[PDB]
Structures are given as C-alpha cells and as structure tokens.
Amino acid sequence: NAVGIAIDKVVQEFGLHNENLEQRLEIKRIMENVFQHKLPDCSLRLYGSSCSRLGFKNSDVNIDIQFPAIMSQPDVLLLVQECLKNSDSFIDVDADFHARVPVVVCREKQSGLLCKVSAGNENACLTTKHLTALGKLEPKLVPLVIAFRYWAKLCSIDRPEEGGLPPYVFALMAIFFLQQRKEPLLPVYLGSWIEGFSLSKLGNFNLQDIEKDVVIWEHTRETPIKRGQVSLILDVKHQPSVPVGQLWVELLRFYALEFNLADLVISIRVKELVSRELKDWPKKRIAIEDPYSVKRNVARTLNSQPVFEYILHCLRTTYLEPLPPLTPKFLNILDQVCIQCYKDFSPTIIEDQAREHIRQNLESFIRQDFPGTKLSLFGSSKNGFGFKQSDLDVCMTINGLIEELARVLRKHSGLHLRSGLLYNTLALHNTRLLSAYSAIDPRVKYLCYTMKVFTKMCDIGDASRGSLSSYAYTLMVLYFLQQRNPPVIPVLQEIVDGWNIDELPTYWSECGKNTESVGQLWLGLLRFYTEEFDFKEHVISIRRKSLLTTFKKQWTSIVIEDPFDLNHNLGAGLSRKMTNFIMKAFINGRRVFGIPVKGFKMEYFFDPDVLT
C-alpha cells in the first residue's frame, strides 16, 4: 500500500484527468464542422491514449477518419490536408505521409496540442477499445501504465523518432505482466481450452472485435467457421485485494531477472511462452506482439542494440553557397565544349555497320542451334544517344513463341575479339521513346552526351557499384529538360506487358518557347538538381508533366521511374554511400562549371582528379 499510494500521486501529477477528456472532445467537435463541407459522408473515430487515458496529460490527440469503400485512403488524406490548411483554428500544418502510418500533423491554436489525423487505421482504433475496456474493469491497470510510461520518459525511451519504443508498446508490457502472474488478474483470450487448439497454428486465430465486455475471436461477411468468446475479466469473487504498488515493483523484477527478453515473445493472447522460432524472428532484440495485429513486430521500431540494453538497464535501476554570375564568353565556351562532347564521342557509320554485322553474326550462330531466332539491338546504340566503347544490348526472341544459351556461345571461337566491345520488349519501347525525344532538338542530344561524359569521368554509372545506370541519367536529363519554367520538349505520353516529330509543333502550344543556350541549360541542370529539386519529396518521372511525390508510390527510400515501367524502381539498390558520392560529384561539377575564369578545355573542365 505504501508504494501503491506513490503511483497514485504520479497519476495525479502526469495522468489525463476528466477536464482533459472533454477538452479533447471539443477538438473532435471543431474537426466535425471542418470536414463536413467537403466530406459530409465521412466520420471520425477517436482513438489512442485519449480514450484509453493511458497516456500523459499533454499527450497528442490521435484521431482517425473512416470513409466508405468507394473512396481511397490517399484521396481522403489529400482532401483532409486541404481542409486543415485553410482553417484559422490550426497552425503548423505538415504532411508527413512517408511514415509507417500516413497522418496529418497539426497543432491546435487554442490548446496547443498536436493532433495526429490518421485515416483508415482500423487496427489502431480497435486496439484502443481493448486498452480502454481493460482500464475501466481493472482500476489498478491505469496507475501501472502511467507510472511505467513516466519512468521511460525520464530515461528517454518513449521517443519513436529517436529509436525508442513507441508509446503503445508500453501498455502491452503492463498487461502481459499481470497475465503471467501465477495468480492471474486477467484471462487469456486464446488457450488450449479451445477445441483443436495448438501452438502450431496460433497465427490463424484473430480477435475480430470486443462487444458487451466480451472479446470475440475467429479462426480460419459471416462464414461458418469455428468461433468463440472469452470474457475480459477473470470471474473471481474472493481474490485478495493486493496493493497496486506490489504489481509495479514485481513488474520490474519479472522483466529484469525472471522473464528472458532476448529469446522470448510477449503475447497477451496465450499463457504459454512463445519463442522466436515459432514466429521466425531474430533473437537479437526485444519482440512484442499486438493482440489485434498478429503481424506487429517491435523489432522494426527497435533496430539499435545499445538502446535494447538501455531498456533493460533503466528497468533494473528502478527495481550550397552562392556562385559568381555567368558571363557571355564563358557561356559561349560552355556551348563549344558541349558541342565538342557530342561530336567526339558519336559513333560513326563504320561503327554502326560493324554493330549491324555483329548482330547478323550472332543471329546466324544462334539460328544454327535455335532456328527461327530473332535478335534486336537496344540500349545506347539505338536510343538516339550514341556512345563509343559502349555495351551492346540485344534482346533475344524466338519466332512462333540462359544456361543453355551460354553453352552455345562457347563453341564460336571469336567470343568480341574483332570489335573489342530474353524478350526485353520494354527496353526496345523505351529505346524508341528516347530516340523520339532526341530527334526533337539538337540541344537534347548535346546535353545527353554531356551527361554521359560527365558520369563517365566521375566514375559513376556502373550497376555493380550500386550507382544509377546510364538509362536512369538519360531519363533524368529529360526530366530537367521538361521541368524548367520554359519548356524545351513535351512529354510524349500525354500528347504491352500490362503497361501503356514533324507535326509536334502543331499540337504543342509551347513549341520553341525556350531560347537559352546549351551551356546555360547544362549549368541550369546542375543548379536545379543541387539547389532546387528535392529528392526526398519528389520522383523523377517523364510520364506526365505534373509533380509526383514519393508518398503515392510509397518509395520512401535518388528515386527515378521508368516511363512505362511504373512499379519498377531503378534506384532500388541505391545505397546512401553512393548517393553521397553522386551528390558530391554533382556539387563539384557545379563548382567547376559555375565559376567563370578568364584565360586557359576538355582536359580542364572534365578532370577526374578535380571532379573527385
């Protein structure tokens, strides 16, 4: 009772009392009239630590929105974002949709509390009911959670951004502790009592919802399958009224000396200990399971090791500068150098006929063993952007329709000594797209050749290195050419495999608008990609001229997109180290090409040592 009184004082100091309960309800009341004008059919379901009243007094307001099946979740939050920004009652509106749960962050003007406006998060909403139901039935639970959470805040363990445990995980720890007690105060919703139960198929069972102080679970629209119900409270009429202080102290003991937090899983659904082997999870760090969410893993939130030992430690104790202005003559020098980069590296007719001869030889040789084959070159060779000593990409195809193919090539003596250099349809299609984009204007080919030489001199463009491929840069340069304020060329898609020049001026209204020199565009590309364009909130894509944020495709982690290959991401294997090197190279290019110098071209501007 001595310690049991101490926690109650903690509850008074940092608990959420009634006056805060209604004050937060008026938050929902004011939200109601904001979303009503544009989304009359939508409704709000209050959730989080507010209804469960397990959080602190100054806890954030967690509010969820429910919409019919016709509307899509991204469409609702986009509309909700507009409804909150144009409201004078709210400030500091932010759109952090790239988190695990897309929510809209805003601060109440009167109270100053942070409101987390989630959408379509039924898992969290139903979780609050379970937490809320237990709190009322178990008056000793609320003091335990508030005191338990308060101690973590002192140690800096409750911060999600820092890597600390999210606040909702702390509620599960307190609930599970009471269940594990040999004199349980709470019942288990899942157990061996159920007919045909077994730990092997524990994942099939799921708690649908709670109604009338009774949990409902289903095993695998109403269907005729095994179903049952379990009460939320053990029906004991003469259990000792032990002080709440003992539970708080015993909680520290169980998780510090008795319960193994490194090789066991916490689950409030069953009494038997669940090991990491059953769920096939690491034993490196703590693992916790949410009742309604049977796939919830706390390892995702807690990846760092020192923090994991820190959790066990604290519990034991309680027991781009501006650049100079450009000059006309230096702009002319930039134009000259770009044109020179086009004219030196462009394959000649003898090289194209040599490629055609190579294609014919390969076609015949493969026809010897695989008659009816049809080969077609692709890549830099025929995309309208030539390049010497470049890889020759070819697409195998058989009319009328890797290990075996390789064995055949070993037979031919020449494999290419002379030159020294399956069903890839999308590659051919984007090759034609790139050729069409190149034929529109000589500046496009000039800047693309300049980009190719720039990436070749900076030791980037290699797939094995993990950096972006040359095709990605070819798309990116077109993205810059299309994104600048004066359009130079349009997106050809707006004007197969589940994926969708003379007369262009007639249809395109802004044809010929840009009159800037080629060197000016080359420097503008660097400026745009180093100072203006943000890679963390936009996606490089030439499918349409409108913006494309990363949240829609959920590519939360440079991002470039294929014109026809939407779901495929070229920067999937892009490691942050390579991104740092890429941006360093681009900054160096801006430095060299943005500082005019009088008196002295290829050997100087594109110097590998200086640029790296």
Numbering used by the authors: 293 to 512, 528 to 626, 987 to 1068, 1080 to 1093, 1111 to 1116, 1122 to 1195, 1206 to 1210, 1217 to 1273, ...
Q: What did the study's authors say about this model?
A:
Tumor-suppressor let-7 pre-microRNAs (miRNAs) are regulated by terminal uridylyltransferases TUT7 and TUT4 that either promote let-7 maturation by adding a single uridine nucleotide to the pre-miRNA 3′ end or mark them for degradation by the addition of multiple uridines. Oligo-uridylation is increased in cells by enhanced TUT7/4 expression and especially by the RNA-binding pluripotency factor LIN28A. TUT4 and TUT7 are multidomain enzymes whose specific targeting of RNAs makes use of three zinc fingers, combined with two copies of a nucleotidyltransferase domain (NTD), one inactive in the N-terminal half of the polypeptide (pseudo-NTD) and one active in the C-terminal half. Our structures reveal that pre-miRNAs engage the enzymes in fundamentally different ways depending on the presence of LIN28A, which clamps them onto the TUTs to enable processive 3′ oligo-uridylation.
